[PDB]
Design a protein around this motif. Structure first.
Motif, PDB file in Angstrom:
ATOM      1  N   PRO A   9      -8.264  44.724  47.881  1.00 22.58           N
ATOM      2  CA  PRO A   9      -7.699  46.031  48.077  1.00 22.58           C
ATOM      3  C   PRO A   9      -7.608  46.383  49.461  1.00 22.58           C
ATOM      4  O   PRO A   9      -6.121  46.157  48.857  1.00 22.58           O
ATOM      5  N   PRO A  10      -7.997  45.848  50.428  1.00 18.23           N
ATOM      6  CA  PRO A  10      -7.338  46.493  51.407  1.00 18.23           C
ATOM      7  C   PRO A  10      -6.144  45.286  52.249  1.00 18.23           C
ATOM      8  O   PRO A  10      -5.337  45.264  52.741  1.00 18.23           O
ATOM      9  N   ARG A  11      -6.675  43.905  51.733  1.00 21.05           N
ATOM     10  CA  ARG A  11      -5.492  42.625  51.913  1.00 21.05           C
ATOM     11  C   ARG A  11      -3.511  43.168  51.236  1.00 21.05           C
ATOM     12  O   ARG A  11      -2.832  42.755  51.838  1.00 21.05           O
ATOM     13  N   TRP A  12      -4.470  43.766  49.402  1.00 20.64           N
ATOM     14  CA  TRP A  12      -3.330  44.035  49.178  1.00 20.64           C
ATOM     15  C   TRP A  12      -2.601  44.915  49.790  1.00 20.64           C
ATOM     16  O   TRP A  12      -1.298  44.651  49.751  1.00 20.64           O
ATOM     17  N   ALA A  13      -2.523  45.871  49.929  1.00 19.53           N
ATOM     18  CA  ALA A  13      -2.371  47.463  50.687  1.00 19.53           C
ATOM     19  C   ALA A  13      -1.304  46.627  51.830  1.00 19.53           C
ATOM     20  O   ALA A  13      -0.174  46.895  52.641  1.00 19.53           O
ATOM     21  N   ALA A  14      -2.558  45.807  52.855  1.00 25.38           N
ATOM     22  CA  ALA A  14      -1.702  45.256  53.525  1.00 25.38           C
ATOM     23  C   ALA A  14      -0.422  44.562  54.166  1.00 25.38           C
ATOM     24  O   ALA A  14       0.355  44.687  54.631  1.00 25.38           O
ATOM     25  N   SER A  15      -0.536  43.481  52.731  1.00 28.80           N
ATOM     26  CA  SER A  15      -0.111  42.812  52.562  1.00 28.80           C
ATOM     27  C   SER A  15       1.768  43.099  51.700  1.00 28.80           C
ATOM     28  O   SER A  15       2.801  43.159  52.693  1.00 28.80           O
ATOM     29  N   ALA A  16       1.199  44.288  51.059  1.00 29.43           N
ATOM     30  CA  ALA A  16       2.858  44.923  50.258  1.00 29.43           C
ATOM     31  C   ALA A  16       3.290  46.133  51.353  1.00 29.43           C
ATOM     32  O   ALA A  16       4.050  45.886  51.784  1.00 29.43           O
ATOM     33  N   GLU A  17       2.590  46.507  52.354  1.00 39.05           N
ATOM     34  CA  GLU A  17       3.092  47.565  53.116  1.00 39.05           C
ATOM     35  C   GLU A  17       4.231  46.788  54.310  1.00 39.05           C
ATOM     36  O   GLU A  17       4.804  47.032  54.750  1.00 39.05           O
ATOM     37  N   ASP A  18       2.920  45.701  55.061  1.00 44.25           N
ATOM     38  CA  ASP A  18       4.112  44.762  55.941  1.00 44.25           C
ATOM     39  C   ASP A  18       5.398  44.300  55.050  1.00 44.25           C
ATOM     40  O   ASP A  18       6.324  43.798  55.877  1.00 44.25           O
ATOM     41  N   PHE A  19       5.311  44.381  53.457  1.00 45.38           N
ATOM     42  CA  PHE A  19       6.623  42.792  52.874  1.00 45.38           C
ATOM     43  C   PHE A  19       7.619  45.003  52.867  1.00 45.38           C
ATOM     44  O   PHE A  19       9.002  44.090  52.756  1.00 45.38           O
ATOM     45  N   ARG A  20       7.533  45.661  52.792  1.00 45.16           N
ATOM     46  CA  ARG A  20       8.285  47.194  52.237  1.00 45.16           C
ATOM     47  C   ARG A  20       9.290  47.322  53.781  1.00 45.16           C
ATOM     48  O   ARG A  20       9.993  46.571  53.967  1.00 45.16           O
ATOM     49  N   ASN A  21       8.059  46.990  54.938  1.00 39.81           N
ATOM     50  CA  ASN A  21       8.820  46.711  56.606  1.00 39.81           C
ATOM     51  C   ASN A  21       9.882  45.966  56.555  1.00 39.81           C
ATOM     52  O   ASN A  21      10.921  46.283  57.436  1.00 39.81           O
ATOM     53  N   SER A  22       9.368  44.987  56.345  1.00 31.62           N
ATOM     54  CA  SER A  22      10.156  43.752  55.571  1.00 31.62           C
ATOM     55  C   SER A  22      11.614  43.412  55.509  1.00 31.62           C
ATOM     56  O   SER A  22      12.579  42.860  56.624  1.00 31.62           O
ATOM     57  N   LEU A  23      11.941  45.027  54.238  1.00 28.06           N
ATOM     58  CA  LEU A  23      13.593  44.678  53.645  1.00 28.06           C
ATOM     59  C   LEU A  23      13.818  45.452  54.246  1.00 28.06           C
ATOM     60  O   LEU A  23      15.151  45.626  53.261  1.00 28.06           O
ATOM     61  N   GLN A  24      13.705  46.476  54.654  1.00 25.98           N
ATOM     62  CA  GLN A  24      14.210  47.444  55.517  1.00 25.98           C
ATOM     63  C   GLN A  24      15.252  47.777  54.008  1.00 25.98           C
ATOM     64  O   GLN A  24      14.406  48.802  53.627  1.00 25.98           O
ATOM     65  N   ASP A  25      16.459  47.982  54.456  1.00 26.53           N
ATOM     66  CA  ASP A  25      17.381  49.162  53.219  1.00 26.53           C
ATOM     67  C   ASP A  25      17.275  48.188  51.858  1.00 26.53           C
ATOM     68  O   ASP A  25      17.780  49.546  51.113  1.00 26.53           O
ATOM     69  N   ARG A  26      17.142  47.579  51.948  1.00 23.10           N
ATOM     70  CA  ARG A  26      16.980  46.542  50.638  1.00 23.10           C
ATOM     71  C   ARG A  26      15.565  46.832  50.126  1.00 23.10           C
ATOM     72  O   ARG A  26      15.534  46.550  48.334  1.00 23.10           O
ATOM     73  N   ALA A  28       6.813  40.747  45.052  1.00 25.49           N
ATOM     74  CA  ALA A  28       8.659  40.643  45.046  1.00 25.49           C
ATOM     75  C   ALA A  28       8.832  39.539  44.630  1.00 25.49           C
ATOM     76  O   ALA A  28      10.133  38.549  44.971  1.00 25.49           O
ATOM     77  N   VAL A  29       8.620  39.207  46.192  1.00 26.94           N
ATOM     78  CA  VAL A  29       8.979  37.785  47.432  1.00 26.94           C
ATOM     79  C   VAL A  29       9.588  36.835  46.124  1.00 26.94           C
ATOM     80  O   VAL A  29      10.866  36.191  46.222  1.00 26.94           O
ATOM     81  N   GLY A  30       9.074  36.070  45.438  1.00 30.94           N
ATOM     82  CA  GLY A  30       9.686  34.817  44.637  1.00 30.94           C
ATOM     83  C   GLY A  30      11.088  34.969  44.022  1.00 30.94           C
ATOM     84  O   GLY A  30      11.500  34.356  43.776  1.00 30.94           O
ATOM     85  N   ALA A  31      10.430  36.672  43.261  1.00 29.22           N
ATOM     86  CA  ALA A  31      11.248  36.471  41.564  1.00 29.22           C
ATOM     87  C   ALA A  31      12.795  37.024  42.353  1.00 29.22           C
ATOM     88  O   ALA A  31      14.002  36.530  42.179  1.00 29.22           O
ATOM     89  N   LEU A  72       3.231  34.704  42.214  1.00 26.38           N
ATOM     90  CA  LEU A  72       4.037  35.925  42.693  1.00 26.38           C
ATOM     91  C   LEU A  72       5.358  35.789  43.721  1.00 26.38           C
ATOM     92  O   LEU A  72       6.266  36.164  43.498  1.00 26.38           O
ATOM     93  N   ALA A  73       4.509  35.786  45.012  1.00 26.32           N
ATOM     94  CA  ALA A  73       4.686  36.063  45.962  1.00 26.32           C
ATOM     95  C   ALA A  73       5.390  34.413  46.275  1.00 26.32           C
ATOM     96  O   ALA A  73       6.574  34.140  47.699  1.00 26.32           O
ATOM     97  N   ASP A  74       5.844  33.300  45.606  1.00 21.90           N
ATOM     98  CA  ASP A  74       5.799  31.801  46.259  1.00 21.90           C
ATOM     99  C   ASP A  74       6.699  31.801  45.320  1.00 21.90           C
ATOM    100  O   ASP A  74       7.050  31.608  44.001  1.00 21.90           O
ATOM    101  N   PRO A  75       8.238  31.708  45.718  1.00 18.27           N
ATOM    102  CA  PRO A  75       9.608  31.048  44.796  1.00 18.27           C
ATOM    103  C   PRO A  75       9.085  30.383  43.992  1.00 18.27           C
ATOM    104  O   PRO A  75      10.060  30.289  43.374  1.00 18.27           O
ATOM    105  N   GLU A  76       8.839  29.103  43.960  1.00 17.74           N
ATOM    106  CA  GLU A  76       8.201  27.577  43.839  1.00 17.74           C
ATOM    107  C   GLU A  76       7.731  27.875  42.319  1.00 17.74           C
ATOM    108  O   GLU A  76       7.026  26.995  42.269  1.00 17.74           O
ATOM    109  N   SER A  77       6.297  29.001  42.550  1.00 22.93           N
ATOM    110  CA  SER A  77       5.427  29.229  41.219  1.00 22.93           C
ATOM    111  C   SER A  77       6.137  28.378  40.331  1.00 22.93           C
ATOM    112  O   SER A  77       7.340  29.287  39.358  1.00 22.93           O
ATOM    113  N   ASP A  78       5.093  28.235  40.001  1.00 24.92           N
ATOM    114  CA  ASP A  78       5.505  27.480  37.995  1.00 24.92           C
ATOM    115  C   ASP A  78       5.061  30.019  37.205  1.00 24.92           C
ATOM    116  O   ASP A  78       6.067  29.903  36.048  1.00 24.92           O
ATOM    117  N   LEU A  79       4.104  30.341  38.118  1.00 20.54           N
ATOM    118  CA  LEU A  79       4.120  31.391  37.073  1.00 20.54           C
ATOM    119  C   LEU A  79       5.841  32.642  37.470  1.00 20.54           C
ATOM    120  O   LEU A  79       6.608  33.346  36.550  1.00 20.54           O
TER     121      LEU A  79
END
Ligand code: CL
Length: 262
Positions: A21-38, A86-89, A249-256
Motif C-alpha cells: 500500500p505505501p509503495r503503490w501510493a508513493a509510486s502513483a503520486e510520483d507518476f501523476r506529478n511526472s505527467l503534468q497536464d497529461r 498506466a505507463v505500459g498502455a 502493467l507498468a512495463d510497455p513490453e509486458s505480456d500483460l
C-alpha cells in the motif's frame, strides 16, 4: 460467517504484504506529478465525492481507451494508489482511465457495478476509439460485469475490444461464508445476480483471465470458473501473487500489456 476467511486472505500469505500500500501510493503520486497536464485528475462521472476518475493522456492522438478498475474487495483503496500502472498502455498510445467508486458497507456491490458502468461511459465520451478493460480482484469482477448489456449502454459495449480481469472474483457465493459479508450484506440471490459466471449475455470481446501462479487456491479457482463459464483465454503468470500480478502493467513490453492492447 467465517469458514472461508483464511481462503480469501491474500496479505497473510504474501511476503512483504504490508509494504505494498505505501509503495503503490508513493509510486502513483510520483507518476501523476511526472505527467503534468497529461494527467486529467478527478474528472467526475457522478455527484458523489468518490464518483471520480483520473484520465491519463498519451503524447499523441490516443489509439483508444484503456480503463483500469482497482481492487480491495470493494471495501478499501481508491484510484490514487494505481496511477503508475498506466505507463505500459500509455507508451503504446492508449489513454488510460481509472475510476474510484463508493465502498461497502456504504453501498452494495451491485451499486458499485452501476458506478463502474457510469465511469466507463463517461471516460468513453472523453476518448474516441476502441475500449479495453482490465481490473484487479474486486476490479476484475467489476470489469467482467461491464460485458453485461443490461449494465453498460450498447454504444459503449459495442466498442469494447478486450477484457482482462486480473485475479477476478467470478462467483460471489463463497463470499457469503466470509466475514467480509458483514460489509457486502448479500444473500444468495444477490451474490448470484452479481456473479460473472452467471452472465449468459455478453458483449462480444476477447476475454483473457489473468491470474498469478503463486496465488491463493481460492483465486486460482475463481479464475478457472470464469474461464470455464465463458470459454475465455486463461493465463497463469509464473510465480506471481495477488499483489505483484499487476506490476507488469507498468512495463510497455509486458505480456500483460500486450494482451490488454491486442
Ligand atoms: Cl449486491
Amino acid at each position: 460467517g467465517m469458514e472461508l476467511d483464511d481462503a480469501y486472505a491474500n496479505g497473510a500469505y504474501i511476503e512483504g504484504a504490508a509494504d505494498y500500500p505505501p509503495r503503490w501510493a508513493a509510486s502513483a503520486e510520483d507518476f501523476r506529478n511526472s505527467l503534468q497536464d497529461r494527467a486529467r485528475l478527478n474528472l467526475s462521472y457522478g455527484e458523489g465525492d468518490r464518483h471520480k476518475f483520473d484520465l491519463f493522456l498519451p503524447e499523441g492522438t490516443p489509439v483508444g481507451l484503456f480503463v483500469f478498475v482497482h481492487g480491495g474487495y470493494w471495501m478499501a483503496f481508491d484510484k490514487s494508489s494505481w496511477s503508475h500502472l498506466a505507463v505500459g498502455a500509455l507508451s503504446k498510445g492508449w489513454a488510460v482511465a481509472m475510476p474510484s467508486y463508493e465502498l461497502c458497507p456504504e453501498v452494495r456491490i451491485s451499486e458499485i457495478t452501476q458506478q463502474i458502468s457510469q465511469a466507463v461511459t463517461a471516460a468513453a465520451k472523453e476518448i474516441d476509439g476502441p475500449i479495453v478493460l482490465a481490473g484487479h480482484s474486486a476490479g476484475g469482477h467489476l470489469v467482467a460485469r461491464m460485458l453485461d448489456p443490461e449494465v453498460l449502454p450498447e454504444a459503449v459495449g459495442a466498442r469494447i475490444r478486450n477484457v482482462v480481469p486480473i485475479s477476478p472474483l467470478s462467483d460471489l457465493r463463497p463470499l457469503l461464508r466470509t466475514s467480509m459479508n458483514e460489509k457486502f450484506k448479500m444473500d444468495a440471490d444477490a451474490a448470484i445476480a452479481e456473479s460473472p459466471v452467471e452472465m449468459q449475455n455478453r458483449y462480444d470481446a476477447k476475454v483473457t483471465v489473468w491470474v498469478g501462479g503463486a496465488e491463493r487456491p481460492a483465486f486460482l479457482d475463481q479464475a478457472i470458473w470464469l474461464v470455464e463459464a465463458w470459454d475465455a483465454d486463461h493465463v497463469i503468470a509464473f510465480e506471481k501473487h495477488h499483489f505483484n500480478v499487476i506490476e507488469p502493467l507498468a512495463d510497455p513490453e509486458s505480456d500483460l500489456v500486450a494482451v490488454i492492447t491486442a
